Design a protein around this ligand. Sequence first.
Ligand SMILES: *[C@@H]1O[C@H](CO)[C@@H](O[C@@H]2O[C@H](CO)[C@@H](O[C@@H]3O[C@H](CO)[C@@H](O)[C@H](O[C@H]4O[C@H](CO)[C@@H](O)[C@H](O)[C@@H]4O)[C@@H]3O)[C@H](O)[C@H]2NC(C)=O)[C@H](O)[C@H]1NC(C)=O
Ligand SMILES: *[C@@H]1O[C@H](CO)[C@@H](O[C@@H]2O[C@H](CO)[C@@H](O[C@@H]3O[C@H](CO)[C@@H](O)[C@H](O[C@H]4O[C@H](CO)[C@@H](O)[C@H](O)[C@@H]4O)[C@@H]3O)[C@H](O)[C@H]2NC(C)=O)[C@H](O)[C@H]1NC(C)=O
Lengths: 304, 304
Amino acid sequence: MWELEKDVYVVEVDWTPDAPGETVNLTCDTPEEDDITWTSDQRHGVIGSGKTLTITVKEFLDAGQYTCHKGGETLSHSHLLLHKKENGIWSTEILKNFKNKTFLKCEAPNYSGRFTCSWLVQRNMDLKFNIKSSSSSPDSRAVTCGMASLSAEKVTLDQRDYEKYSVSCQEDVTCPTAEETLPIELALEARQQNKYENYSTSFFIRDIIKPDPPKNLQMKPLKNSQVEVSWEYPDSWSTPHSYFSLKFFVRIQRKEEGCNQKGAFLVEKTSTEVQCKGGNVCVQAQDRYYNSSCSKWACVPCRV
Amino acid sequence: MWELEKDVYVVEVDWTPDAPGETVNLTCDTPEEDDITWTSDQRHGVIGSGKTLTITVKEFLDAGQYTCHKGGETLSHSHLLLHKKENGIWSTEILKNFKNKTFLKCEAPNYSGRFTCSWLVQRNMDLKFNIKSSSSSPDSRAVTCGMASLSAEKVTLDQRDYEKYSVSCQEDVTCPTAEETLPIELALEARQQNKYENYSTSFFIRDIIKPDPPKNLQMKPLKNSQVEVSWEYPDSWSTPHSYFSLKFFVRIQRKGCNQKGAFLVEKTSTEVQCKGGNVCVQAQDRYYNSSCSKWACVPCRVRS
Ligand SMILES: *[C@@H]1O[C@H](CO)[C@@H](O[C@@H]2O[C@H](CO)[C@@H](O[C@@H]3O[C@H](CO)[C@@H](O)[C@H](O[C@H]4O[C@H](CO)[C@@H](O)[C@H](O)[C@@H]4O)[C@@H]3O)[C@H](O)[C@H]2NC(C)=O)[C@H](O)[C@H]1NC(C)=O
Ligand SMILES: *[C@@H]1O[C@H](CO)[C@@H](O[C@@H]2O[C@H](CO)[C@@H](O[C@@H]3O[C@H](CO)[C@@H](O)[C@H](O[C@H]4O[C@H](CO)[C@@H](O)[C@H](O)[C@@H]4O)[C@@H]3O)[C@H](O)[C@H]2NC(C)=O)[C@H](O)[C@H]1NC(C)=O
C-alpha cells in the first residue's frame, strides 16, 4: 500500500487466481482511541472496530471509501484504490491503444516547447486523469501540464467509437536552436471507480512535430487549362521560416491520414502549377530537415 | 542619510536656496567614550568633541572625511557624500547627456549576452564609478559588470569635447535564441569629490545590437568593367547564421543606418560597375531594425 494523495491509498494486488490478498492497516485520524467503529461504501453495516482496522483485500469489494466513527458522528475517512498486477504485468485495461499499440500519443505544432498528449478510453465513466513529469531526477526535462479534457469528436477504431481525452503541456525551459540530448519522460495516472493504472511515454520534441495544415490555399487560372496553386506556412509554425522550413506534398483527387498514405509530388516552394481541369488539389506539410509527422491535408476545388 | 559602503554615507541635501540643512549624527567606532575629539579634511582644527558628533550639512564644506581621535591617534573615520535635490529633482551634473536625453548608451555586437555601456563626464577629476544590476529581484536579469575605464576616444557634442568612460558586462545566464520578455536594468553610481549621483537605464539586447562590419571584403575585377564585391559575416556575430541572418547594403562612392542611398542584398556578394570609385557595404539584422555596422570599403579597380 502506498499513499497517492491525502487519505487516498493504492493497494497493489496480485490477480493470479490463488494469490493471497494483501493485508493493510487503516488508522482513524483522531486524538481519541475508545469505541471507534468502521464502515465501508461497499458493505452495509459495521465491519470492524478499534483505532486500527486490519483488512484483507483481493477484490474490488474490499476497496473504496472506509470511514471511522464514534458516537454517531464522522471522524475521518480513507479511500482505497486497487492496482492489478496479473501474471507480473500491471493492468492496462482503462485505456484503449491506438492502431499502433501505444496508449499515449503526443504531438507538437512547433518547436516552442508546447505539445499535447492524447489517449482513448474503454469506458467513459467515473474517470480521473493526472499527467506529470516522471522520474524528476536531476537533468530531467521539467514539464508543466494542464488538466485533461474530453473531445467531442470520437475516434473510430475497427467498429467502435472510442472517446478521446487530451491534455496540453509546456516545457518549462526551451532554447529552441539547441539540440535535445535527453527525452521528455511523462507519466499518466488513470483512475476509474476504484481502479488505479498508470502509463508512461518518452520522446523528443523533434520526433513529435506535426505542423498545422497550410493556410490560404488559392487557385489562379492560366492558359492551357493550367492553374496556379499557392499557399502559406501556417501561423502556428516556428519562425523564422528561413531556419524552420517546411517541405510540401501536392496531390490531385478525382472524387489514410499519415504522410505516405497517398501518392503525391513534392515541392519546397509555397506554389506550383498543375493541370487538373476537374477534381480537387490537396497539400500537406512536413519539416524539411527532420522526418517529423506530416500535417493534415488542406484541399481546395479545381473549378470547371 | 544612508550608507553606501563601510564608513561612507550619502546625505540627501535640498538645494533650494532657503532650505534648512540636514542634521546628521556621527559615532566614533571605539570602546572608549571620554576625551574624544573630531576633525575634518575640510575644516582644520578641532570642530567638536564627544563620542557622537552632531553637525548640520547644507554645503560641500560640511562634507568629506570626519575623523575622531583620542590621545593624539586616529580611532576611526567617516566620509560624507552629498546627493543634491534641487527643485525636487536629483542632480545629474557629473555626466553629460548624449544626442538625446540619455546619459548611458550601451551596444552589443551579437546576442551572446555580452554588452558594453558608456557615459560622458563634464570634468575628468577625482572620479569613481560603480555599475551593477538594478533591483536584482527574483525574475530580474542578473548581470555581472567589470570596472569602468577611460576610453582613448573622446567625443564631440555641439562644439565642445567630452571624455568617455566604458565598461564591459555579461549576462550571467543566457539562451541567445530565446525572446527577451523583460529588460535588463542597470544603475550607475557616479562620485566626484564629495558629490553623489546615480543613473538608471533599461534596454533589451535586441535593441542595442550593432553588428561588426563585414569581414574579408574583397573586389574581383571582371571583363567589361564589372566587378564582384563579396564579404563574410563578421566573426563576432551570433551563430548559426541560418538563424541569426544579416541583410547588407552596398553603396558606391565617387570619392549611419539610413543616411545614404544604397542597394540591398541579403546574400554576401553582388556585381557592380564602378570604374574607379569605392564600393562600401554595411550590415544590419535581417529581422529587427537594430543599429547598422560601420561601413567596410574596398577600392574599385579596372582590369581583366
Ligand atoms: C506507477 O505505478 C507503480 C505501481 O503502483 C508505482 O509504484 C509505487 O510507487 C510508490 C511511491 O510512489 C512506492 O511506495 C513507496 O515504497 C517505498 C519502499 O517501500 C517506501 O519507502 C515509500 O514510503 C515512504 O513514502 C510514503 C509516502 O509519503 C510514506 O507513507 C512512508 O512513510 C515513507 O516515507 C512508499 O511506500 C511503491 O512501492 C511503488 N511500487 C512499486 C512496486 O513500484 C509508481 O509510482 C507509478 N508511477 C507514477 C509515475 O505514478
Ligand atoms: C539612487 O539615489 C537615491 C537617492 O540617494 C537612492 O535612494 C535612497 O536609498 C537608500 C537605500 O535604500 C535609502 O536609505 C534607507 O532608508 C530606509 C528607509 O526605510 C532604511 O530602511 C535603510 O536602512 C538600511 O540600513 C539600516 C542600517 O544598517 C538597516 O537597519 C536597515 O534594515 C536598512 O538595511 C536606509 O537608511 C534612502 O531612503 C533612499 N532615498 C530616497 C528615497 O531617495 C537610491 O537607492 C539610489 N539607487 C541606487 C541603485 O543606488
